[PDB]
Amino acid sequence: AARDLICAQKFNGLTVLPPLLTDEMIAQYTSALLAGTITSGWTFGAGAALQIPFAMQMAYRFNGIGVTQNVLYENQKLIANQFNSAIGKIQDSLSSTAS
Amino acid sequence: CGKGYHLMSFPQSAPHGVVFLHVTYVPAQEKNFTTAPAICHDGKAHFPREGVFVSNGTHWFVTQRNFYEPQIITTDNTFVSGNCDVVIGIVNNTVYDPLQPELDSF
Amino acid sequence: LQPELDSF
Ligand SMILES: *[C@@H]1O[C@H](CO)[C@@H](O[C@@H]2O[C@H](CO)[C@@H](O)[C@H](O)[C@H]2NC(C)=O)[C@H](O)[C@H]1NC(C)=O
Ligand SMILES: *[C@@H]1O[C@H](CO)[C@@H](O[C@@H]2O[C@H](CO)[C@@H](O)[C@H](O)[C@H]2NC(C)=O)[C@H](O)[C@H]1NC(C)=O
Ligand SMILES: *[C@@H]1O[C@H](CO)[C@@H](O)[C@H](O)[C@H]1NC(C)=O
Ligand SMILES: *[C@@H]1O[C@H](CO)[C@@H](O)[C@H](O)[C@H]1NC(C)=O
């Protein structure tokens, strides 16, 4: 019945080309970046991937901002709970707010 | 400034542009090791000042992260913060004191 | 450092 906007654009010579990287391959890049971040650290971006426990990586991250290692190693569960609550808050804010 | 840990750069002119030679540092030959976040000695937790604790199976060493240069564990490169029942993954080992054997040796 | 050498 009513002509679609996409068909009205197509019938006058206005086409849209597809991107080279599909959504699954962009997601594969994102998954590779996330796995290299959480299992190796910053070493995979500056050479080969060097495996390290995540607690030692976060202790290095606190050393990067002028805080010593005992702050992490004495408050590991508190930081884990705060990170999990932050991720849940991002999830709830993305589910509710659409702006 | 180039891929890897950046060391230097050198400029060169080019027709309508510039060319940078980025001299950088890349680690080469990895090696597996067993690590611990801290060492409980005499009921006190010891953390490294700079570096990381590694072990080749029997003895523990402390070394910097970007190069395998193992050294024996002393009180000069470790600091004490609290006891050893809070940190998870902590191990039992001894820490050499650089003063007392030289004191009795005199 | 001083009390330890005072002990010795
Ligand atoms: C530092 O702040 C954290 C929260 O950011 C406090 O942890 C809370 O402590 C209260 C009472 O001890 C608990 O009811 C909460 O469940 C804790 N929150 C979390 C996320 O674990 C912590 O007590 C504060 N530290 C000090 C010394 O006040
Ligand atoms: C792990 O490192 C230690 C470092 O002390 C090695 O022990 C030395 O091994 C050499 C020969 O490989 C001996 O000549 C030394 O006397 C040893 N030192 C001590 C203090 O015993 C050890 O061989 C290494 N390898 C393992 C345990 O497989
Ligand atoms: C270390 O151990 C892992 C698991 O056995 C192995 O895949 C890897 O090749 C080893 N060597 C290095 C240098 O990572
Ligand atoms: C370390 O030694 C103490 C006392 O010597 C002991 O209570 C503790 O269980 C030991 N830790 C481990 C992991 O064996």
Q: Identify the residue whose C-alpha is closest to ligand 1 atom 7.
A: A78
- C6 in contact with chain B, both atoms CB, cutoff 8 A: no
User: Mind spelling out the 3-state secondary structure of chain B?
Assistant: CCCCEEEEEEEEEECCEEEEEEEEECCCCCCCCEEECCEEECCEEEEECCCEEEECCCCEEEECCCCCCCECCECCCEEECCCCCCCCCCEECCCECCCHHHHHHC
Cα distance between residue A15 and residue A12, in whole Å? 9
Residues 6 or more apart from C7 whose CB is under 8 A from it? Answer: none
Residue whose pair of structure tokens reads 């597996």 in the numeric block: B32
* Residues in chain A closer than 8 A to B37 (CB atoms): 53, 55-56, 59, 69, 73
Residue in the block written with tokens 């490294």: B48
- Which ligand is in closest contact with the Cα of B33? 3
Closest CA to B86 of A13, A4, A65, A72: A72
Residue B102 CA, ligand 4 centroid: distance in Å: 29
Give me the half-sphere count of Cα atoms (radius 13 Å) on the Cβ side of residue B88.
8
Assess contact for A54 and A76: CB atoms under 8 A: no
* Atom 1 of ligand 3: nearest residue by CA position: B32
Count of other CB atoms within 10 angstroms of residue B27: 16
Amino acid letter for position A44 = F
Resolution in Å, one decimal place: 3.3
Cβ atoms of B72 and B98 closer than 8 Å: no
Q: Are B90 and B48 in contact (CB under 8 A)?
A: no
Q: Please list, in sequence order, all residues whose beta carbon lies within 8 angstroms of the beta carbon of residue B54, skipping any fewer than 6 positions away.
A: B33, B34, B35, B60, B61, B62, B63, B70
For residue A68, the SS3 value is: coil
Determine the atom of ligand 2 nearest the C-alpha atom of B56: 1
| DSSP conformation class of A44 | G
